[PDB]
RNA sequence: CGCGCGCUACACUGACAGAGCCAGCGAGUACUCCCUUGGCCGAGAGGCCCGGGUAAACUCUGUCGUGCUGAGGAAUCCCUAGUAAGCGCAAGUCAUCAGCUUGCG
């Protein structure tokens, strides 16, 4: 697959969107040809983008840890003041989440409060039934994996902050048992060269990491906007 | 003492709502008459069913 | 029609009538399942018309 | 033994710790000023008189506690000092801006005794420490007078000393016999 | 071979097992200490049997309590009943009956509900 | 809807033969006018209640200035007796 | 000590209300109310689950701070709450 | 007999953009008094201008007062 | 249109942020809140993907301070111990009951 087709298609698509003011996400729709069965392939992943997805001007992260919440809150009070303490408004363990936040109004207030979410890989299995469907199933604001894994068994704190810096702007990947998925690459206010770079590295990482029996199982990637038509890419 | 003026309607009756805006008063009157007619229709239909 | 919420016996049934006037006409009627379960229309439901 | 001392500056007092020397609590309930932040010999209760004339007495714990016990608004003109009695726990004194010093008791809503006789601002005063000097009060004014009163007879001053300068500070000596009046350049 | 006494305690729906063995003097409720498990004002309800009997009686025993059910108040009353009945039953079995009778007399003179749970039946004025 | 006075209901109460002198709201009106214009009300040391024959007990705020005319006063008193309050 | 904090182990000597206030020297000034103001059996906190409303004059035996607490929980929104009332009594006595 | 009362005149009514009445309350409770300004909005204004929440209104210099009157005109020029 | 019976709103018994800690009844291969803008694979009917509309309470610690941000008249009725009152959780049993009913703590 050559990226010149992606560049001409995404330029035509931005012209199609235009002809604040845009503020629409652009994604590519993955199709595969065989059903997906492995529950370890059904795990949500992240793809680190070369141009990060988030603006990081005023957005607030929420960080969901597992075992002692006081240890992780003291690490947040310890480590890094420039980028991290302005963003990390809450550190919630999964026990405190399942305790305090079971109500529809409470999880609606949390979803309206915070801007983007991060969780640990031992918790995102638990999270679609801890956090509500109005948090999880509806929109893109849903937790991204951050590997806080080696008194809690935790990775060392500079690697923790490096992982959170990598994972704030990363692109979330959900897989589904069906054969069609879609994955966001950016917005419509961006430049199409950056868009085509994001689509290229997402194609590389999506196939060669997540879709099993990789380029055998691949089907068409159709670049799409919110309400527009889809443009081909590797039929 | 800073005295104040008692707000009251001169020709008072309990049988009439008081509202400045005729649009809002008329919309509330139409909603009340629609509820009354719907309840009367449901009562007549239920007695005919029994 | 189609069931909407199903309790032990009383089920709420959705895609059959259009208004509470029509339900009040067909109050007490012998409703039936495809399976063979008999039943009776009891009361119109307020919030979904 | 305790680890509390209070410094008032502007519209708030700030109870400091002795060991840590940090501002342990900052109390800014006052409307306008706070002219002496004086805590009781028990060490749980702070009195402070404002610039609007009220004095507020409020409990502080070891931590962040500012629960208001009583408020008096009888002076109606500023109160510059308000001091606890060194022996009794509920008796306190007040030198206000007008002409008056006066004795209060904490349960009552009335000043228990009133002492007049000064002709200018009275702004410094203390009780007299001693076994024999149970109820004597000294206060100096801005009228260049130090007066010491018996609290048993609320007439005039028992003794009066006239200086040459506006009298800024007063302290008795712990033997109870002698007294230092700080007035001007001497 | 080991000296061990298991005693139950009861309130509305809050029940407490207290196992009392020969020990150094600790009291644990749900694996946490007795000075931790309660609301902050009902710890004086928990410390009632210890302060009645004195600490010299509890110097030799180790009590482990589990509680389930009820609310905070019912669980606190169940814990204090399990504590009092537990030390009385240990002194029944493993030291003298005169000490058992002295402990029972002091606890009954303070409050009978430390030993005998009185359920609230329904019998109003018939 | 108007208060029961001796102005226009003199025929009704004289026909039904029950104490034409009793139904007088003008006493309450002139006395409440007196008390609201008095300087002890303007200083603020006056508090005024009305008890009617029906058992109705009305507190009148000192901060009110009543209608000085009996027609507006009767309409205001009817609205008070039916809505249990008069907002400013 | 079994498990006791320092304030309780300090005032381990006698029965003290809220672990701070003694019942030793308390004199009821009126002769008529010595029967009905019950300070004879001391209590630690007023929260005592006692059936003091079974029959007549049984409320003449419950301690007077429990009466003060149970009458503090008196309006429409303070009805069930007893820890609020014993906390109000503790703060008021301090 | 000469101590500087350069700060003791602070409990007076200050004037601002729209309201002519803004006395001493605090620094964030004084911002609520201006119409259209909220209780959660007033804390965002103070963290940009390096003014402390501990101070009152009237404890600010003639430079520090006007810094909150520019930033109340344009909330977009300072990032939000 | 009238009448009550429930439900809701109406501020010191306050709001915000934290920390900690408590139930009982409940398991029929059975349960799902709508309807839609687009696109995938669909000769056609559909299935997908992405958008739009185990408690409450309680306890402890801090941050701010009465600010359309106002607890119900005459009457009339009911109520004496786990009773009045507050609170949530669950079920929906051939009659009644989802605008709610009945349990349970």
- Per the entry, the structure determination technique was cryo-EM
Give nearest nucleotide to A174 (CA–C1'). Answer: I49
**Nearest Cα to Cα of residue D181 among D158, D160, D154:** D160
Rounded to the nearest 10 degrees, the angle between the axes of helix G64-72 and helix G83-93 is: 120
**Phi-psi map region of A234: left, alpha, beta (phi>0 left; psi -120 to 50 alpha):** left
D155, D114 contact by CB (below 8 A): no
Residues 56-85 of chain F within 7 A of strand I, judged by CB, are: 56-57, 84-85
Gyration radius of chain D's alpha carbons: 16
Count of all residues that appear for chain G in the document: 94
Nucleotides of I under 7 A from a protein CB: 1, 13, 17-24, 28, 30-35, 37-41, 47-52, 54-65, 70, 72-75, 80-86, 91-99, 105
D108 at the H interface (CB within 8 A)? no
- Extended beta strands in chain E, E state: 4-10, 14-22, 27-29, 32-33, 61-69
Does the CB of D65 sit below 7 A from strand I? Answer: yes
Pair F75, B35: CB distance under 8 Å: no
Question: To which residue do tokens 């001392």 refer?
Answer: D5
Beta-strand ranges (E) seen in chain D are 4-9, 12-17, 23-27, 38-39, 45-49, 55-59, 67-72, 79-84, 91-96, 101-105, 111-115, 122-127, 136-141, 145-150, 159-162, 167-172, 179-183
Question: In angstroms, what separates the C-alpha of B47 from chain C's closest C-alpha?
Answer: 9
Resolution (Å) of this entry: 3.5
Cα-based angle E38, E44, E47 (whole degrees, multiple of 5): 90
Please, are residues A194 and A202 in contact by the beta-carbon 8 Å criterion?
no
Cβ–Cβ of D11/H54 closer than 8 Å? Answer: no
Whose CA is closest to D117, among D90, D92, D137?
D137
D50 touches chain H (CB under 8 A): no
A57 contacts chain H (CB < 8 A): yes
Give the Cα separation of A66 and A52 in Å (integer): 26
D118 CB-near residues (< 8 Å, 6+ apart): D99, D100, D101, D139, D141, D143, D145, D147
Q: What distance separates the 2 farthest-apart alpha carbons in chain E?
A: 54
**DSSP bridge pairs for E64:** E19, E28
Least Cα distance to G28 among G19, G18, G36 occurs for: G36
Q: G8 vs E77: CB contact, 8 Å cut-off?
A: no
Residue F1 burial (CB count, 10 A): 13
Residue among G37, G23, G10 nearest G93 (CA)? G23
Asked if A4 has any chain H CB less than 8 Å from its own CB, the reply is no
Which two tokens mark E71?
């609310």
B42–C contact, CB cutoff 8 A: yes
Place of tokens 């040809």: A33
Q: How many other C-beta atoms lie within 10 A of the C-beta of residue D78?
A: 19
CA dihedral angle for residue D163, residue D167, residue D169, residue D174, rounded to 10 degrees: 30
Angle at H70 between CA H69 and CA H71, to 5 degrees: 95
Contacting residues for H38 by C-beta, under 8 A, at least 6 apart: H32
Q: Are the C-beta atoms of residues D69 and D59 closer than 8 Å to each other?
A: yes
Closest Cα partner for G70 from G88, G54, G87, G82?
G82
D124 strand-pairing partners: D140
Which residues, in sequence order, are bridge partners of residue D92? D84, D104
Phi, psi (degrees; rounded to nearest 5) at A135: -80, -45
E85 is known to lie in a ligand binding site = no
Q: Enumerate the residues of chain C whose CB falls inside 8 A of the CB of residue B49.
A: 24-28
Phi, psi of C30 (to 5 degrees): -80, 100
Categorise residue A23: left if φ over 0, alpha if ψ from -120 to 50, beta otherwise. left
Q: What tokens appear for G58 in the block?
A: 């049984």
For residue C20, the chain B residue with the least C-alpha distance is: B42
The reply to whether the CB atom of residue E118 sits less than 7 A from any atom in nucleic acid chain I is: no
């Amino acid at each position: 697959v050559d990226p010149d087709q992606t560049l001409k298609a995404c330029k035509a698509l931005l012209a199609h969107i235009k002809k604040t003011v845009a503020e629409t996400p652009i994604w590519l729709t993955l199709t595969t040809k065989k059903h997906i069965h492995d529950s370890h392939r059904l795990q949500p992943g992240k793809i680190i983008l070369p141009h990060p997805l988030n603006t990081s001007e005023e957005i607030s992260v929420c960080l969901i840890t597992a075992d002692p919440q006081r240890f992780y809150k003291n690490a947040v009070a310890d480590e890094f003041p420039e980028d991290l303490r302005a963003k990390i408004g809450r550190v919630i363990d999964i026990s405190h989440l399942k305790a305090k936040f079971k109500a529809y109004e409470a999880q609606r207030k949390l979803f309206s409060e915070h801007d983007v979410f991060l969780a640990d890989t031992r918790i995102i299995n638990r999270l679609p039934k801890a956090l509500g469907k109005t948090f999880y199933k509806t929109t893109t604001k849903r937790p991204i994996p951050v590997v806080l894994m080696a008194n809690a068994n935790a990775r060392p704190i500079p690697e923790i902050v490096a992982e959170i810096r990598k994972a704030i702007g990363a692109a979330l990947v959900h897989l589904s048992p069906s054969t069609n998925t879609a994955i966001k690459v950016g917005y419509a206010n961006w430049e199409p060269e950056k868009l085509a770079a994001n689509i290229e590295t997402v194609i590389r990482e999506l196939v060669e990491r997540f879709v099993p029996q990789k380029w055998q199982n691949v089907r068409n990637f159709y670049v799409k906007g919110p309400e527009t038509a889809a443009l081909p890419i590797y039929q | 003492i800073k005295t104040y003026i008692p707000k009251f309607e001169d020709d008072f009756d309990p049988d009439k709502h008081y509202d400045p805006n005729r649009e809002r008063a008329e919309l509330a009157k139409l909603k009340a008459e629609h509820k009354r007619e719907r309840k009367g229709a449901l009562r007549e239909l239920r007695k005919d069913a029994q | 029609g189609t069931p909407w919420k199903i309790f032990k016996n009383t089920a709420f049934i959705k895609d059959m009538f259009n208004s509470s006037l029509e339900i009040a006409k067909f109050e007490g009627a012998a409703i039936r399942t495809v399976s063979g379960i008999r039943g009776q229309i009891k009361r119109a439901l307020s919030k979904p018309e | 033994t305790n680890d509390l001392f209070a410094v008032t500056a502007g519209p708030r007092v700030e109870i400091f710790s002795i060991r840590k020397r940090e501002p342990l609590k900052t109390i800014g309930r006052f409307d306008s000023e706070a002219h002496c932040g004086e805590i009781r010999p028990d060490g749980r209760v702070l009195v402070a008189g404002e610039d609007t004339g009220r004095m507020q007495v409020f409990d502080v714990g070891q931590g962040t506690r500012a629960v208001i016990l009583k408020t008096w608004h009888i002076h109606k003109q500023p109160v510059w000092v308000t001091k606890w009695s060194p022996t009794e726990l509920t008796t306190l004194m007040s030198c206000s801006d007008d002409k008056t010093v006066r004795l209060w008791d904490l349960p009552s809503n009335d000043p228990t005794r009133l002492f007049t006789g000064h002709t200018d601002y009275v702004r410094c005063g203390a009780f007299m420490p001693g076994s024999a000097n149970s109820n004597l009060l000294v206060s100096g004014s801005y009228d260049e007078t130090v007066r010491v009163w018996d609290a048993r007879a609320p007439g005039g001053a028992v003794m009066t000393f006239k200086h040459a300068d506006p009298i800024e500070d007063v302290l008795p000596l712990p033997s109870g016999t002698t007294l230092l009046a700080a007035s001007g350049n001497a | 071979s080991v000296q061990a006494v298991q005693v139950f305690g009861k309130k509305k729906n809050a029940t407490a097992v207290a196992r009392c063995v020969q020990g150094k003097g600790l009291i644990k409720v749900n694996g946490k200490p007795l000075k931790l498990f309660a609301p902050e004002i009902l710890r004086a309800k928990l410390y009632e049997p210890i302060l009645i009997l004195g600490t010299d009686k509890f110097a030799d025993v180790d009590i482990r309590i589990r509680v389930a059910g009820g609310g905070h108040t019912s669980q606190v009353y169940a814990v204090r009943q399990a504590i009092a009945k537990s030390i009385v039953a240990y002194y029944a079995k493993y030291v003298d009956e005169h000490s058992k009778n002295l402990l029972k007399q002091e606890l009954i003179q303070f409050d009978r509900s430390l030993l005998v749970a009185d359920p609230r039946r329904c019998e109003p004025k018939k | 809807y108007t208060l029961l006075n001796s102005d226009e209901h003199i025929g009704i109460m004289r026909k039904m033969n029950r104490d034409i002198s009793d139904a007088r709201p003008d006493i309450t009106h002139q006395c409440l006018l007196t008390l609201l214009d008095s300087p002890i009300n303007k200083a603020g040391k006056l508090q005024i209640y009305i008890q009617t024959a029906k058992g109705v007990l009305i507190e009148v705020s000192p901060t009110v200035r009543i209608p000085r005319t009996f027609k507006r006063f009767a309409g205001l008193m009817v609205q008070l007796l039916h809505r249990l309050s008069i907002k400013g | 000590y079994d498990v006791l904090p320092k304030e309780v182990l300090a005032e381990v000597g006698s029965v003290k209300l809220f672990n701070r206030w003694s019942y030793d020297d308390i004199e009821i000034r009126d002769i008529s109310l010595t029967d009905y103001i019950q300070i004879r059996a001391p209590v630690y906190i007023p929260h005592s689950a006692g059936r003091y409303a079974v029959k007549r004059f049984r409320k003449a035996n419950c301690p007077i701070i429990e009466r003060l607490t149970n009458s503090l929980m008196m309006h429409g929104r303070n009805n069930g709450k007893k820890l609020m009332a014993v906390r109000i009594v503790a703060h008021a006595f301090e | 007999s000469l101590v500087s009362g350069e700060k003791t005149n602070f409990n007076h009514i200050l004037r601002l953009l729209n309201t002519n009445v803004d006395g001493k309350q605090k620094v964030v409770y004084a911002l609520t008094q201006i119409k259209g300004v909220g209780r959660r909005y007033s804390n965002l204004v103070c963290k940009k201008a390096d003014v402390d929440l501990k101070k009152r209104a009237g404890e600010l210099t003639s430079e520090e007062l006007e810094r909150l009157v520019t930033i109340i005109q344009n909330p977009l020029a300072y990032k939000i």
